[PDB]
């Protein structure tokens, strides 16, 4: 739902990854260096 | 769909790259797949590409995309407000001004020949000032037609206020159109003029009790100088001191006394107020019709340019590389946007991704939330490629 | 949950990441020579005015 909200509110300008943790989930996003505020 | 769409055709604005291909026809162009592979073989394709603008970074492109989406929604609501204001005047029916030539050319011919042509815009400046200037020009054009409609409503309220003084029930109306120099004498302080409104059944009681209603009265005044729909108007001359006894006997007789004084300035201002209100409303409607037509045409052209700039900014922001893409407008018939939207969304849904593609057809809008707009600042539907729904 | 969406997202993110840096470098390289030319003109004008 966070990837659907990020894709609906920001387009295809992000990375959708998921990592299993000990429960928790490891997520990682990639974007530009000047779009850290948005 | 749309609030001003009665018998107008629907168009779908799609944007894709120049090296993309569909999923139902590998090794074919998008134009041949839209023309030949269209639903029913009647899909009309037109050019909708425009010139590229100067882009500084993605941070200004995101704020230009959100401001272009909000200005596109405000221009879309301002076009429907001017369309409803022009339709409310009875100057455009449900089969005119929606399926006729606008701007002296057709919707498909003018939309196919729309190559970013303007008379006050440029190609080397920022798109944010042009979109904000177009949204401010459309908002001022709708505000001018709204102010003209409010002035026409105030002139109609002034004409309706003058209509109660012109005629009707004798409770607030005064005789200023049937007055003569032989029925109301107010040239001296001895004699005066007093109006008495009596019913049709109480005419003989007021005519017989008119002499005994007050002292110092004038006989032979029982005549129908004015007529109403609920009572009759009679003229009686007497002194100013006997107005209290005549009004007391008239109130005890179940009659309706009228307070009227002989004056030419009251009838002249009463007729001049209704004449000035009627001429002001008559001029305000004729000015509001042409102002609503020009504001509707300028709001249509600004809505088309803002829709093309929002489609190009949405395709450039959603697509990324390369900077150039193939943007065109597909003309669909009435009640056929669901098949072209489901076939185009199902065919072009694999370009963006297999996890963000869903089956959808048509455009369903709601009063609580406008859906199917492709908003980038609020919660709404999203697809893999740029897709906009325009209902004329 | 598909790899093609992540590959297309990274493929667009690389071109956008290059286009942002090129868009900044074109602006800085567009402004720097004009600023240096303006200061280089103003200093010579002030020096000629003091010399006269």
Swiss-Prot record, chain A:
Subunit structure: V-ATPase is a heteromultimeric enzyme composed of a peripheral catalytic V1 complex (components A to H) attached to an integral membrane V0 proton pore complex (components: a, c, c', c'', d, e, f and VOA1).
Post-translational modification comment from the UniProt entry: Glycosylated.
Family (UniProt): Belongs to the V-ATPase 116 kDa subunit family.
Additional free-text comment from the UniProt record: Present with 55714 molecules/cell in log phase SD medium.
Role, per record: Subunit of the V0 complex of vacuolar(H+)-ATPase (V-ATPase), a multisubunit enzyme composed of a peripheral complex (V1) that hydrolyzes ATP and a membrane integral complex (V0) that translocates protons. V-ATPase is responsible for acidifying and maintaining the pH of intracellular compartments. Is present only in vacuolar V-ATPase complexes; enzymes containing this subunit have a 4-fold higher ratio of proton transport to ATP hydrolysis than complexes containing the Golgi/endosomal isoform and undergo reversible dissociation of V1 and V0 in response to glucose depletion.
Compartment annotation: Vacuole membrane
Organism of this sequence: Saccharomyces cerevisiae (strain ATCC 204508 / S288c) (Baker's yeast)
Protein name: V-type proton ATPase subunit a, vacuolar isoform
From Swiss-Prot, chain B:
A Pfam family this chain is assigned to: V-ATPase_C
Classification via CDD domains: V-ATPase_C (cd14785)
Topology relative to the membrane: Peripheral membrane protein
Subunit structure: V-ATPase is a heteromultimeric enzyme composed of a peripheral catalytic V1 complex (components A to H) attached to an integral membrane V0 proton pore complex (components: a, c, c', c'', d, e, f and VOA1). Interacts directly with VMA4.
Mutagenesis or variant effect for residue 255 to A: Is rapidly degraded and disrupts stable ATPase assembly
Assigned protein family: Belongs to the V-ATPase C subunit family.
The keyword Transport is assigned to this record: yes
Cystine bridges: none
Protein name: V-type proton ATPase subunit C
Modified residues (N-acetylalanine): 2
Localization in the cell: Vacuole membrane
Further facts: Present with 21114 molecules/cell in log phase SD medium.
Keyword list, A-Z: Acetylation, ATP-binding, Hydrogen ion transport, Ion transport, Membrane, Nucleotide-binding, Transport, Vacuole
From Swiss-Prot, chain C:
Mutation effect (residue 2 to A): Increases ATPase activity 1.4-fold
Lineage: Eukaryota, Fungi, Dikarya, Ascomycota, Saccharomycotina
Chain positions covered by the region annotation Interaction with VMA10: 12-31
Name of encoding gene: VMA4
Additional free-text comment from the UniProt record: Present with 16134 molecules/cell in log phase SD medium.
Subunit structure: Homodimer. V-ATPase is a heteromultimeric enzyme composed of a peripheral catalytic V1 complex (components A to H) attached to an integral membrane V0 proton pore complex (components: a, c, c', c'', d, e, f and VOA1). Interacts with VMA5; the interaction is direct. Interacts with VMA10; the interaction is direct. Interacts with RAV1 and RAV2 components of the RAVE complex, which are essential for the stability and assembly of V-ATPase.
Localization (cell): Vacuole membrane
Region Interaction with VMA5, annotated ranges: 1-13
Descriptive protein name: V-type proton ATPase subunit E
Coiled coil location: 8-38
Protein role: Subunit of the V1 complex of vacuolar(H+)-ATPase (V-ATPase), a multisubunit enzyme composed of a peripheral complex (V1) that hydrolyzes ATP and a membrane integral complex (V0) that translocates protons. V-ATPase is responsible for acidifying and maintaining the pH of intracellular compartments.
Family of this protein: Belongs to the V-ATPase E subunit family.
């Amino acid at each position: 739902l966070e990837q659907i909200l990020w894709r609906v509110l920001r387009g295809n300008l992000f990375f959708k990854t998921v990592e299993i943790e000990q429960k928790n989930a490891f997520i990682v996003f990639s974007h530009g260096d000047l779009i850290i505020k948005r | 769909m749309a609030t001003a769409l009665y018998t107008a055709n629907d168009f779908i604005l799609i944007s894709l790259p120049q090296n993309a291909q569909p999923v139902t026809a590998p090794g074919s162009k998008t134009d041949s797949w839209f023309n030949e592979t269209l639903i029913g073989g009647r899909a009309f394709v037109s050019d909708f590409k425009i010139p590229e603008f100067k882009i500084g970074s993605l941070d200004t492109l995101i704020v230009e995309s959100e401001e272009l989406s909000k200005v596109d929604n405000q221009i879309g609501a301002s076009i429907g407000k001017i369309i409803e204001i022009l339709q409310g005047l009875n100057e455009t029916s449900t089969n005119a001004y929606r399926t006729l030539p606008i701007n002296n050319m057709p919707v498909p011919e003018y939309l196919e020949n729309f190559q970013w042509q303007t008379r006050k815009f440029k190609l080397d400046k920022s798109i944010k000032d042009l979109i904000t200037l177009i949204s401010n020009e459309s908002s001022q054009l709708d505000a001018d037609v709204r102010a003209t409609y409010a002035n026409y409503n105030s002139a109609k309220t002034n004409l309706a206020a003058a209509e109660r003084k012109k005629t009707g029930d004798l409770s607030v109306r005064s005789l200023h159109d049937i007055v003569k120099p032989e029925d109301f004498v107010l040239n001296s302080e001895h004699l005066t003029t007093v109006l008495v409104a009596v019913p049709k059944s109480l005419k003989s009681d007021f005519e017989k009790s008119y002499e005994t209603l007050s002292k110092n009265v004038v006989p032979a005044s029982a005549s129908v100088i004015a007529e109403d729909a609920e009572y009759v108007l009679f003229n009686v001359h007497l002194f100013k001191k006997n107005v209290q006894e005549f009004t007391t006997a008239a109130r005890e007789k179940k009659f309706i006394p009228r307070e009227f004084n002989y004056s030419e300035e009251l009838i002249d201002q009463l007729k001049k107020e209704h004449d000035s209100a009627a001429s002001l409303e008559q001029s305000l409607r004729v000015q509001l019709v042409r102002l609503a037509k020009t504001a509707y045409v300028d709001v249509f052209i600004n809505w088309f340019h803002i829709k093309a700039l929002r489609v190009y900014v949405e395709s450039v922001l959603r697509y990324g590389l390369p900077p150039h893409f193939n943007i065109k407008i597909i003309a669909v018939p009435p009640k056929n946007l669901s098949k072209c939207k489901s076939e185009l969304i199902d065919a072009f849904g694999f370009l963006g991704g297999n996890a963000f593609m869903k089956d959808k057809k048509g455009k369903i809008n709601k009063q609580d939330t406008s859906l199917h707009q492709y908003a980038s600042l609020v919660d709404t539907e999203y697809e893999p490629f740029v897709m906009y729904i325009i209902n004329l | 949950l598909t790899p093609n969406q992540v590959n297309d997202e990274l493929n667009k993110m690389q071109a956008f990441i290059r286009k942002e840096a090129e868009e900044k470098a074109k602006e800085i390289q567009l402004k720097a020579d004009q600023e240096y030319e303006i200061e280089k003109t103003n200093i010579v004008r002030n020096e000629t005015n003091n010399i006269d």
